[PDB]
Amino acid sequence: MVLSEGEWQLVLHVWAKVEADVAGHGQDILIRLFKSHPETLEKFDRFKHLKTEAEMKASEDLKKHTVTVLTALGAILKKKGHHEAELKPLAQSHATKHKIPIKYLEFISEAIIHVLHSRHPGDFGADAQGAMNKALELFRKDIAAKYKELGYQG
Numbered sequence: 001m002v003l004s005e006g007e008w009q010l011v012l013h014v015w016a017k018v019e020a021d022v023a024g025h026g027q028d029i030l031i032r033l034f035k036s037h038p039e040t041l042e043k044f045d046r047f048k049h050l051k052t053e054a055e056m057k058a059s060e061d062l063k064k065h066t067v068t069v070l071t072a073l074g075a076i077l078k079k080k081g082h083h084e085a086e087l088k089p090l091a092q093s094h095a096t097k098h099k100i101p102i103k104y105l106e107f108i109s110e111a112i113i114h115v116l117h118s119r120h121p122g123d124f125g126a127d128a129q130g131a132m133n134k135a136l137e138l139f140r141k142d143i144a145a146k147y148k149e150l151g152y153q154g
């Protein structure tokens with residue numbers, strides 16, 4: 001699949017709002033993932049001791065990680081599909097070291113969409129959500145293809 005330029009601009013216009021405060025958005029997205037799909041937290045040896053939303057919010061180390069995650073995703077989105085170089089290292093680490101199935105990437109995609117819907121109704125109406133869904137679906141399809149090349153079922 002391929003996004004239109006208009007669809008990319010809807011993606012990038014909401015991401016511009018995320019970048020007012022990437023850390024706060026990152027906290028909201030990973031906490032939403034862990035609340036909605038608690039099995040995902042067990043993949044993080046670094047964070048799986050955290051018991052409550054309040055502990056997650058208070059963790060400076062989690063905050064920092066969420067900034068790393070969202071900045072990596074933002075750099076991918078800014079490539080508008082031309083993200084082969086960015087996807088290589090991430091697909092390798094997530095396949096071989098972290099062992100993150102495609103289903104869990106669906107779950108984090110849901111969390112991203114939820115938080116952007118909540119925080120950004122001015123830039124995340126139906127067309128904008130559809131564009132972000134397409135971008136995240138493209139990202140997941142390309143990761144799944146790389147996982148297969150790397151030997152991971154996903």
Ligand code: HEM
Nearest residue numbers: 040043044046068069072073089090093098100104105108
């Ligand atoms: C939008 C999707 C995601 C992006 C962009 C992303 C990005 C990153 C980045 C940049 C790192 C650090 C470098 C590396 O190890 O490759 C990382 C680490 C990690 N990711 Fe992801 N990630 C995503 C989704 C997930 C999901 C859904 C899980 C778990 C369910 C996961 C689990 C991990 C783990 C366990 C680490 C190592 C954390 C640590 O101990 O330092 N990732 N991720």
